[PDB]
Design an enzyme around this catalytic site. Sequence first.
Site, mmCIF file in Angstrom:
data_model
loop_
_atom_site.group_PDB
_atom_site.id
_atom_site.type_symbol
_atom_site.label_atom_id
_atom_site.label_comp_id
_atom_site.label_asym_id
_atom_site.label_seq_id
_atom_site.Cartn_x
_atom_site.Cartn_y
_atom_site.Cartn_z
ATOM 1 N N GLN A 138 9.254 0.844 -14.160
ATOM 2 C CA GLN A 138 10.393 0.026 -14.567
ATOM 3 C C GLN A 138 10.117 -0.598 -15.935
ATOM 4 O O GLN A 138 8.957 -0.757 -16.333
ATOM 5 C CB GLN A 138 10.665 -1.089 -13.530
ATOM 6 C CG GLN A 138 9.575 -2.158 -13.403
ATOM 7 C CD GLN A 138 9.983 -3.339 -12.504
ATOM 8 O OE1 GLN A 138 11.172 -3.669 -12.382
ATOM 9 N NE2 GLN A 138 8.993 -3.991 -11.895
ATOM 10 N N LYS B 26 5.409 0.531 3.349
ATOM 11 C CA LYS B 26 6.592 1.365 3.320
ATOM 12 C C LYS B 26 6.362 2.778 2.830
ATOM 13 O O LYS B 26 6.857 3.724 3.435
ATOM 14 C CB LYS B 26 7.682 0.727 2.453
ATOM 15 C CG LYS B 26 8.998 1.494 2.499
ATOM 16 C CD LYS B 26 10.114 0.786 1.756
ATOM 17 C CE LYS B 26 11.405 1.583 1.914
ATOM 18 N NZ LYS B 26 12.554 0.966 1.205
ATOM 19 N N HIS B 27 5.582 2.907 1.756
ATOM 20 C CA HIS B 27 5.320 4.199 1.144
ATOM 21 C C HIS B 27 3.861 4.685 1.210
ATOM 22 O O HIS B 27 3.605 5.850 1.513
ATOM 23 C CB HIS B 27 5.759 4.155 -0.319
ATOM 24 C CG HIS B 27 7.216 3.835 -0.514
ATOM 25 N ND1 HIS B 27 8.214 4.739 -0.223
ATOM 26 C CD2 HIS B 27 7.833 2.740 -1.018
ATOM 27 C CE1 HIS B 27 9.385 4.220 -0.550
ATOM 28 N NE2 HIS B 27 9.183 3.010 -1.036
ATOM 29 N N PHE C 59 4.483 -7.805 -3.021
ATOM 30 C CA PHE C 59 5.101 -6.589 -3.554
ATOM 31 C C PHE C 59 4.164 -5.413 -3.240
ATOM 32 O O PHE C 59 4.615 -4.386 -2.755
ATOM 33 C CB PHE C 59 5.326 -6.747 -5.065
ATOM 34 C CG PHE C 59 6.082 -5.597 -5.731
ATOM 35 C CD1 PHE C 59 6.974 -4.806 -5.023
ATOM 36 C CD2 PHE C 59 5.898 -5.342 -7.091
ATOM 37 C CE1 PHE C 59 7.678 -3.757 -5.663
ATOM 38 C CE2 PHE C 59 6.586 -4.312 -7.746
ATOM 39 C CZ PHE C 59 7.483 -3.511 -7.031
ATOM 40 N N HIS D 25 4.107 -4.630 0.590
ATOM 41 C CA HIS D 25 5.332 -3.958 0.981
ATOM 42 C C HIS D 25 5.311 -2.471 0.556
ATOM 43 O O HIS D 25 5.660 -1.601 1.349
ATOM 44 C CB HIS D 25 6.533 -4.664 0.365
ATOM 45 C CG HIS D 25 7.819 -3.913 0.542
ATOM 46 N ND1 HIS D 25 8.323 -3.582 1.781
ATOM 47 C CD2 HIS D 25 8.695 -3.420 -0.365
ATOM 48 C CE1 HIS D 25 9.455 -2.916 1.631
ATOM 49 N NE2 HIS D 25 9.704 -2.804 0.338
ATOM 50 N N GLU D 26 4.908 -2.186 -0.682
ATOM 51 C CA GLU D 26 4.844 -0.798 -1.163
ATOM 52 C C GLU D 26 3.826 0.015 -0.356
ATOM 53 O O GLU D 26 4.069 1.182 -0.017
ATOM 54 C CB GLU D 26 4.474 -0.768 -2.639
ATOM 55 C CG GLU D 26 5.577 -1.264 -3.530
ATOM 56 C CD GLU D 26 6.842 -0.431 -3.402
ATOM 57 O OE1 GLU D 26 7.918 -1.026 -3.297
ATOM 58 O OE2 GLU D 26 6.771 0.812 -3.423
ATOM 59 N N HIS E 275 6.698 0.578 -10.426
ATOM 60 C CA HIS E 275 7.572 0.101 -9.366
ATOM 61 C C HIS E 275 6.968 0.709 -8.093
ATOM 62 O O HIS E 275 6.572 -0.025 -7.166
ATOM 63 C CB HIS E 275 9.021 0.575 -9.530
ATOM 64 C CG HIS E 275 9.901 0.177 -8.379
ATOM 65 N ND1 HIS E 275 11.275 0.219 -8.431
ATOM 66 C CD2 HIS E 275 9.590 -0.295 -7.142
ATOM 67 C CE1 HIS E 275 11.776 -0.210 -7.286
ATOM 68 N NE2 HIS E 275 10.775 -0.530 -6.485
HETATM 69 N N1 5GP Z 1 12.542 -3.206 -8.825
HETATM 70 C C1 5GP Z 1 11.736 -4.225 -8.424
HETATM 71 N N2 5GP Z 1 11.618 -4.573 -7.106
HETATM 72 C C2 5GP Z 1 10.768 -5.668 -6.936
HETATM 73 C C3 5GP Z 1 10.041 -6.337 -7.912
HETATM 74 N N3 5GP Z 1 9.292 -7.400 -7.362
HETATM 75 C C4 5GP Z 1 9.549 -7.297 -6.077
HETATM 76 N N4 5GP Z 1 10.465 -6.335 -5.735
HETATM 77 C C5 5GP Z 1 11.046 -6.028 -4.393
HETATM 78 O O1 5GP Z 1 10.547 -4.749 -3.942
HETATM 79 C C6 5GP Z 1 11.616 -4.034 -3.232
HETATM 80 C C7 5GP Z 1 11.365 -2.573 -3.553
HETATM 81 O O2 5GP Z 1 10.270 -2.031 -2.796
HETATM 82 P P1 5GP Z 1 10.396 -0.578 -2.077
HETATM 83 O O3 5GP Z 1 11.712 -0.606 -1.310
HETATM 84 O O4 5GP Z 1 10.283 0.512 -3.062
HETATM 85 O O5 5GP Z 1 9.187 -0.546 -1.071
HETATM 86 C C8 5GP Z 1 12.914 -4.653 -3.731
HETATM 87 O O6 5GP Z 1 13.917 -4.700 -2.731
HETATM 88 C C9 5GP Z 1 12.566 -6.066 -4.213
HETATM 89 O O7 5GP Z 1 12.991 -7.088 -3.282
HETATM 90 C C10 5GP Z 1 10.106 -5.916 -9.283
HETATM 91 O O8 5GP Z 1 9.465 -6.345 -10.227
HETATM 92 N N5 5GP Z 1 11.057 -4.859 -9.473
HETATM 93 N N1 5GP Z 2 10.743 7.946 -1.213
HETATM 94 C C1 5GP Z 2 11.897 7.390 -1.627
HETATM 95 N N2 5GP Z 2 12.216 6.099 -1.351
HETATM 96 C C2 5GP Z 2 13.507 5.792 -1.799
HETATM 97 C C3 5GP Z 2 14.373 6.603 -2.519
HETATM 98 N N3 5GP Z 2 15.577 5.928 -2.844
HETATM 99 C C4 5GP Z 2 15.430 4.788 -2.225
HETATM 100 N N4 5GP Z 2 14.211 4.608 -1.598
HETATM 101 C C5 5GP Z 2 13.597 3.372 -1.084
HETATM 102 O O1 5GP Z 2 14.642 2.401 -0.771
HETATM 103 C C6 5GP Z 2 14.503 1.232 -1.683
HETATM 104 C C7 5GP Z 2 15.932 0.896 -2.107
HETATM 105 O O2 5GP Z 2 16.283 -0.497 -1.897
HETATM 106 P P1 5GP Z 2 17.813 -1.024 -2.113
HETATM 107 O O3 5GP Z 2 18.078 -0.805 -3.653
HETATM 108 O O4 5GP Z 2 18.704 -0.104 -1.282
HETATM 109 O O5 5GP Z 2 17.957 -2.455 -1.744
HETATM 110 C C8 5GP Z 2 13.528 1.721 -2.746
HETATM 111 O O6 5GP Z 2 12.794 0.690 -3.370
HETATM 112 C C9 5GP Z 2 12.620 2.689 -1.992
HETATM 113 O O7 5GP Z 2 11.568 2.041 -1.266
HETATM 114 C C10 5GP Z 2 14.009 7.945 -2.838
HETATM 115 O O8 5GP Z 2 14.668 8.771 -3.451
HETATM 116 N N5 5GP Z 2 12.716 8.273 -2.337
#
Ligand code: 5GP
Ligand code: 5GP
Length: 204
Positions: A12, A96-97, A89, A92-93, A39
Amino acid sequence: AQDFDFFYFVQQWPASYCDTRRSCCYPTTGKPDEDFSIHGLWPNYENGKWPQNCDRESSLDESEISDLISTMEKNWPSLACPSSDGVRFWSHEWLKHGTCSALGERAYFQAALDFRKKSNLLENLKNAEITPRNGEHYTLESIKKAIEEGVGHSPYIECNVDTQGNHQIYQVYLCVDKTATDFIDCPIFPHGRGCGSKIEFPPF
Ligand SMILES: Nc1nc2c(ncn2[C@@H]2O[C@H](COP(=O)(O)O)[C@@H](O)[C@H]2O)c(=O)[nH]1
Ligand SMILES: Nc1nc2c(ncn2[C@@H]2O[C@H](COP(=O)(O)O)[C@@H](O)[C@H]2O)c(=O)[nH]1
């Protein structure tokens, strides 16, 4: 055997997360560097779906990446509010992933850091004379080409809109093979119809 097909490696542009209608809070370590930050590293399927929350019993153990924390605070900061050290953060990553990646905790985070450095986005753009400034001054084409010349693979660019209505580069997607060894050509790209032909690459 292998539970997935490839990874989306997502970066990002901090300044574009912080000039919108949403709330952005600098990390406990202060204002982030004006550079692309991580990200996520996301296991994905070629059909567009993806695995997530693979081991809900696995929590993030910081001792395993102790020596990496100061680097992650600067290369993988959280910009959400309230201000944090990034650990939530990262946890969570990981849950989840990361748990779906087939990689151990340290290898997962080391891979993200290594690929952020390898992709060297800010510098690849600098080589093409594309530097931060206000207004939709750059063609999307030049941005994709600059990154592509440096990585050897084409990125997918996700744009969002600042407070003044400018469309700006927000996230950059590149694909990594399932063994997390190299960048590869993406089998599929997200379909979030986005990014006009001219976009902004905003300063902080
Ligand atoms: N794009 C983004 N998400 C962040 C950031 N800090 C925390 N988050 C949180 O991380 C989530 C995305 O994590 P993911 O869904 O990929 O596991 C978002 O819904 C948001 O609440 C940041 O710097 N950028
Ligand atoms: N692996 C993967 N995760 C995704 C993709 N699109 C959305 N997600 C997941 O769903 C989150 C979206 O959060 P939202 O923007 O719906 O609040 C992302 O941060 C990520 O963890 C994708 O194309 N691939």
